[PDB]
Design an enzyme around this catalytic site. Structure first.
Site, PDB file in Angstrom:
ATOM      1  N   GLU A 344      56.052 -52.159 -24.869  1.00 24.50           N
ATOM      2  CA  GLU A 344      56.028 -52.809 -23.712  1.00 24.50           C
ATOM      3  C   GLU A 344      54.862 -53.705 -23.647  1.00 24.50           C
ATOM      4  O   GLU A 344      54.982 -54.764 -22.929  1.00 24.50           O
ATOM      5  CB  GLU A 344      55.784 -51.665 -22.648  1.00 24.50           C
ATOM      6  CG  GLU A 344      56.359 -52.105 -21.426  1.00 24.50           C
ATOM      7  CD  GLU A 344      56.011 -51.191 -20.300  1.00 24.50           C
ATOM      8  OE1 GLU A 344      56.330 -51.636 -19.218  1.00 24.50           O
ATOM      9  OE2 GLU A 344      55.251 -50.187 -20.427  1.00 24.50           O
ATOM     10  N   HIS A 375      62.729 -34.192 -44.664  1.00 21.52           N
ATOM     11  CA  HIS A 375      63.998 -33.640 -44.806  1.00 21.52           C
ATOM     12  C   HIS A 375      64.971 -34.692 -44.287  1.00 21.52           C
ATOM     13  O   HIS A 375      66.199 -34.338 -44.379  1.00 21.52           O
ATOM     14  CB  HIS A 375      64.113 -32.334 -44.223  1.00 21.52           C
ATOM     15  CG  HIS A 375      63.430 -31.366 -44.742  1.00 21.52           C
ATOM     16  ND1 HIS A 375      63.535 -30.559 -45.764  1.00 21.52           N
ATOM     17  CD2 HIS A 375      61.953 -31.384 -44.510  1.00 21.52           C
ATOM     18  CE1 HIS A 375      62.285 -29.746 -45.999  1.00 21.52           C
ATOM     19  NE2 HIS A 375      61.518 -30.271 -45.265  1.00 21.52           N
ATOM     20  N   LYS A 490      63.563 -53.247 -12.772  1.00 28.02           N
ATOM     21  CA  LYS A 490      63.696 -52.676 -11.438  1.00 28.02           C
ATOM     22  C   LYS A 490      64.307 -53.418 -10.560  1.00 28.02           C
ATOM     23  O   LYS A 490      65.188 -52.693  -9.479  1.00 28.02           O
ATOM     24  CB  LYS A 490      62.104 -52.347 -10.960  1.00 28.02           C
ATOM     25  CG  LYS A 490      61.449 -51.469 -11.774  1.00 28.02           C
ATOM     26  CD  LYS A 490      60.013 -51.133 -11.105  1.00 28.02           C
ATOM     27  CE  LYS A 490      59.316 -50.253 -12.193  1.00 28.02           C
ATOM     28  NZ  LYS A 490      58.283 -49.576 -11.332  1.00 28.02           N
TER      29      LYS A 490
HETATM   30  O1  LIG Z   1      71.677 -32.948 -45.418  1.00 28.41           O
HETATM   31  C1  LIG Z   1      70.495 -32.587 -45.040  1.00 28.41           C
HETATM   32  C2  LIG Z   1      69.356 -32.460 -46.012  1.00 28.41           C
HETATM   33  O2  LIG Z   1      69.578 -32.069 -47.142  1.00 28.41           O
HETATM   34  C3  LIG Z   1      68.110 -31.663 -45.501  1.00 28.41           C
HETATM   35  O3  LIG Z   1      68.045 -32.252 -44.067  1.00 28.41           O
HETATM   36  C4  LIG Z   1      68.291 -30.235 -45.446  1.00 28.41           C
HETATM   37  O4  LIG Z   1      69.291 -29.798 -44.500  1.00 28.41           O
HETATM   38  C5  LIG Z   1      67.019 -29.548 -45.379  1.00 28.41           C
HETATM   39  O5  LIG Z   1      66.016 -29.897 -46.426  1.00 28.41           O
HETATM   40  C6  LIG Z   1      67.094 -27.861 -45.198  1.00 28.41           C
HETATM   41  O6  LIG Z   1      67.947 -27.662 -46.366  1.00 28.41           O
HETATM   42  P1  LIG Z   1      68.525 -26.220 -46.479  1.00 28.41           P
HETATM   43  O7  LIG Z   1      69.585 -25.844 -45.518  1.00 28.41           O
HETATM   44  O8  LIG Z   1      68.825 -26.001 -47.919  1.00 28.41           O
HETATM   45  O9  LIG Z   1      67.114 -25.204 -46.274  1.00 28.41           O
HETATM   46  O1  LIG Z   2      53.065 -49.916 -17.602  1.00 28.20           O
HETATM   47  C1  LIG Z   2      54.176 -48.986 -17.217  1.00 28.20           C
HETATM   48  C2  LIG Z   2      55.232 -49.730 -16.782  1.00 28.20           C
HETATM   49  O2  LIG Z   2      55.018 -50.897 -15.747  1.00 28.20           O
HETATM   50  C3  LIG Z   2      56.483 -48.764 -16.181  1.00 28.20           C
HETATM   51  O3  LIG Z   2      56.604 -47.840 -17.497  1.00 28.20           O
HETATM   52  C4  LIG Z   2      55.971 -48.021 -15.070  1.00 28.20           C
HETATM   53  O4  LIG Z   2      55.063 -46.935 -15.293  1.00 28.20           O
HETATM   54  C5  LIG Z   2      57.201 -47.253 -14.522  1.00 28.20           C
HETATM   55  O5  LIG Z   2      58.227 -48.161 -14.155  1.00 28.20           O
HETATM   56  C6  LIG Z   2      56.537 -46.420 -13.326  1.00 28.20           C
HETATM   57  O6  LIG Z   2      56.158 -47.141 -12.326  1.00 28.20           O
HETATM   58  P1  LIG Z   2      55.439 -46.729 -11.023  1.00 28.20           P
HETATM   59  O7  LIG Z   2      54.251 -45.815 -11.649  1.00 28.20           O
HETATM   60  O8  LIG Z   2      54.866 -47.709 -10.037  1.00 28.20           O
HETATM   61  O9  LIG Z   2      56.412 -45.616 -10.252  1.00 28.20           O
END
Ligand SMILES: O=C[C@H](O)[C@@H](O)[C@H](O)[C@H](O)COP(=O)(O)O
Ligand SMILES: O=C[C@H](O)[C@@H](O)[C@H](O)[C@H](O)COP(=O)(O)O
Lengths: 517, 517
Positions: A344, A375, A490
């Site tokens: 932002e 993973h 807004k």
């Molecule tokens: O496709 C998914 C990946 O291989 C990986 O996100 C895996 O799921 C984790 O490393 C946990 O593995 P296990 O389920 O064998 O503990």
């Molecule tokens: O710098 C931050 C942005 O301007 C924006 O994330 C803002 O904080 C929200 O739109 C809420 O605004 P209000 O606090 O005025 O409700």
């Protein structure tokens, strides 16, 4: 001298042709690991796994000088008009989130910056008085607010949850999606609940719709309503109304929403959760980095180095994203807040002089925690087609004191070691005869570590990134501190309300509406 | 014919030179809004705000034919060996997550696919029997698991939370960071807690360290331990052990982790939270999309169209990321799961024939919910320097039934209208005399909407993205179904354990360790 016209940028463009090869045998030497690090303000920062050498770092240091980054940081902190676009209508005001914590350490602040500092001190003592009573009467706090009014406070609340004993239950209602309000109302005892409506303007649709939803729920249960609602808003805002709220706390116009977690925007929820003294420790951590960010040597300055290494990756090497990877359950919501604060602020394409720029500014900021990331999308960092620079964040010790020795090490140690192993692996890669199993390496990263996540360290980490993004904006020469894209959002919200109760969406919105319903 | 050698890709490269200008007056006509949409299987999908015209869509359709995407989808669903790399050592096995739900609608499955389908049916009836007892004895379920064993189930659990009445408390312990285990143990009554250890291999460090942490906590409170632990693992795994677990459920080797939410990986936690019948509805929603994904015309096929529009944005227009933006509190964790499923599957840089590729595969997948996103990083989508294609996800109705009429509309309506207004605004932009307030537009997006998020719709949405990523992998010609980068992560974890109780990190890790401590 504008960004592209600085001599040091010219030198850096030649260097970017042939960045150091982190996969060359012996490149990650003890000398390089010692030299390319900085340990200060409770952190160590290692960047031996970034594609930078001494030539590159001397020129980056020259870039901070030619673009006068330190002078602009002073100007910002001293109260100069940094939020403005020359030649055109703009907000034209100071940028003074540093002054909301400057008062916890002696300082020579003048004019608008001094006024913000003393009003922040007056607000904090009103907070201490308020919390003595409120923490005795309520078990539950619900922060109604969106954007800068939610993400920073929420990231800080979960960061500190592991360090500070608390029996308070804390919720955030932000989306105009009423399922957000419903999930929270399902869980809380209204008689025990303090509702904190946080909105700088006092006019954003989401807090206003959500506050009204909660007011009705109190009235339906037949409870006195005003006794439970606290406001946090800009002074003189339509919400600055002590006849409608049990109490009213203030920020000011020069306090940007995405920089407001150290103001009463964060002060109320953090103070209620963990007690006043914890919020002050959080402020001291931020103020300490504010002071440290004036250090003129890039290599001795955490936010300035991180900013210039980001500029190296983004503009000189051409990587369009940065992954922030905290090895920290407490930092589960920190990347979401950084993503707002960086994108932002620096998602801009005109200079402070009103000229369209010819280079790229904010990268996409994304990421998630380790070791989970190992993973999932780390598959693409190791073997996908696009380089993603990584910012690792880690700690030597856990927050909550629960751990276990298995095969000679604690899990806190296994957690840190995994971070180190992955940064080295990303930088060095691995040859293999099997193409499916080879890792090209040269994917850059840095490592930021503190002893333990705490209120103080949370405050330093917050201020660190606030100044990183400010330094990048100062270097690019853009206005980091307005948000005409969010103003447009807004305004669209106001108009679609009127359309459902002229503007360039109307004919389009109507026909879309017909095809989607 | 490989990806770059298809005639239709050659035609598309010429078209990509001058994509349609979505900011030209009258371009988003009623004709275009009607033509560029698809409403089927409970959804409407609008892509009038993508930079595509009829010429482009005819050639993309040709690309699906020349690359034989439908034939590969059949082969995958029928049980062919799709997980393999020719010429080299590889896993070499079928890819059969569709068979884990195929049994809820009549089908002609043979050989390995039929075996997976009947074993899934046998597992589900064992689940129904198990849940009748377990939902009577326990108030609390803790899923221990990481990666594919956590993110899909967790995304689905929060998706359905708003539709299905439940008093169960549900936690996920994943990180080896012990603060993750500690935060959960702080909250639960162990006597009331069922611990579900989910690990396909049965050997991943994180589930094993976490399970041991929980076993000790039961033993410290002096509770019978085995009575509270359930395993979900591959058949014949080291964990497939009925003497160590109250019950043991199975998946199989051809069920990829990032595709396992419809197996018992998701079945146990979802079934316990919301009851058996809700898990079956979830399966029926997925199976319905499995059948729909065989539709040969790209324009009549949701995952095939979304895949080819992604290929248009990624390879032809050159955008390196995609933001998934759900206007849905229930989908708060859906983007994190998609990010794993897409980037881990398609974060590859060699072909199924073992050749290094010369094009880019998976983009960065990132995003967050609306309307919150409108107040933060949407600043960069509207006015930053880099185009980010968006996938909007929305619903006509909320899940929980709480809403409020304000200024003539409900908040559910304001939620949807905001999504529509932003897509149109991103595509059309806005001129302005003030450069700070102008919006260049031509930032593409699509819109996917269902009536209401439900178990069935959650299942369809899950299967939708599973097939989107599969179609993109089939088109690129890569192996979407292994993960040698994640295997490397687990190998680094084994080695850093040994180093703390040889390999190419060791000398590097030691010297880093010294500089960071
Ligand atoms: O496709 C998914 C990946 O291989 C990986 O996100 C895996 O799921 C984790 O490393 C946990 O593995 P296990 O389920 O064998 O503990
Ligand atoms: O710098 C931050 C942005 O301007 C924006 O994330 C803002 O904080 C929200 O739109 C809420 O605004 P209000 O606090 O005025 O409700």
């Amino acid at each position: 001298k504008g960004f592209l016209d600085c001599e040091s940028l010219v030198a850096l463009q030649e260097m970017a042709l042939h960045p150091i090869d982190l996969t060359a045998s012996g490149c990650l030497s003890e000398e390089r690991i010692q030299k390319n690090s900085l340990s200060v303000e409770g952190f160590t920062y290692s960047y031996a796994t970034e594609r930078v050498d001494d030539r590159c770092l001397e020129a980056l240091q020259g870039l901070t000088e030619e673009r006068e980054l330190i002078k602009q940081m002073e100007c910002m902190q001293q109260g100069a008009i940094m939020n403005r676009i020359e030649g055109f209508q703009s907000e034209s005001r100071p940028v003074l989130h540093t002054a909301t914590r400057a008062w916890v350490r002696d300082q020579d602040l003048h004019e608008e910056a001094a006024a913000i500092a003393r009003h922040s001190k007056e607000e904090a003592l009103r907070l201490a008085e308020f919390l003595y009573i409120a923490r005795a009467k309520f078990s539950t706090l619900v922060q109604i607010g969106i954007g800068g009014s939610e993400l920073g406070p929420k990231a800080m609340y979960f960061a500190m949850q592991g360090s500070c004993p608390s029996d308070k239950r804390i919720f955030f209602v932000s989306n105009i999606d009423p399922d957000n309000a419903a999930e929270v109302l399902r869980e809380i005892d209204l008689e025990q609940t303090l509702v904190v409506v946080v909105s700088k303007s006092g006019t954003t649709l989401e807090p206003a719709a959500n506050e009204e939803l909660f007011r009705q729920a109190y009235q339906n249960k037949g409870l006195s309503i005003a006794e439970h609602f606290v406001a946090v808003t800009s002074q003189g805002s339509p919400m600055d109304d002590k006849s409608r709220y049990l109490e009213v706390f203030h920020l000011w116009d020069s306090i940007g929403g995405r920089f407001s977690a150290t103001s009463m925007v964060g002060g109320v929820v953090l103070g209620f959760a963990f007690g006043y003294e914890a919020f002050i420790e959080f402020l001291q951590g931020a103020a300490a980095i504010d002071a440290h960010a004036l250090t003129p040597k890039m290599r001795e300055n955490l936010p300035l180095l991180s900013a210039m290494l980001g500029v190296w990756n983004r503009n000189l090497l051409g990587y369009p994203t940065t992954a922030v990877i905290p090895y920290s359950t407490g930092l589960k919501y920190f990347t979401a807040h950084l993503q707002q604060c960086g994108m932002e602020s620096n998602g801009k394409s005109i200079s402070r002089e009103g000229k369209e720029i010819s280079f790229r500014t904010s990268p996409i900021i994304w990421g998630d925690v380790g070791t989970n990331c190992q993973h999932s999308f780390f598959q693409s960092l190791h073997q996908g087609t696009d380089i993603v620079p990584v910012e690792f964040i880690g700690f030597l010790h856990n927050q909550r004191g629960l751990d276990c020795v298995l095969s000679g090490s604690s899990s806190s140690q296994k957690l840190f070691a995994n971070l180190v192993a992955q940064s080295l692996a990303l930088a060095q890669g691995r040859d293999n005869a099997n193409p499916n199993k080879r890792f090209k390496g040269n994917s850059p990263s840095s490592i930021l570590v503190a002893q333990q996540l705490s209120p103080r360290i949370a405050g330093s980490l917050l201020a660190f990134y606030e100044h990183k993004f400010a330094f990048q904006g100062f270097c690019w020469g853009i206005n980091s501190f307005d948000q005409e894209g969010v103003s447009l959002g807004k305004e669209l919200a106001t108009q679609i309300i009127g359309i459902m109760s002229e503007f360039p969406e109307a004919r389009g919105v109507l026909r879309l509406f017909n095809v989607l319903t």
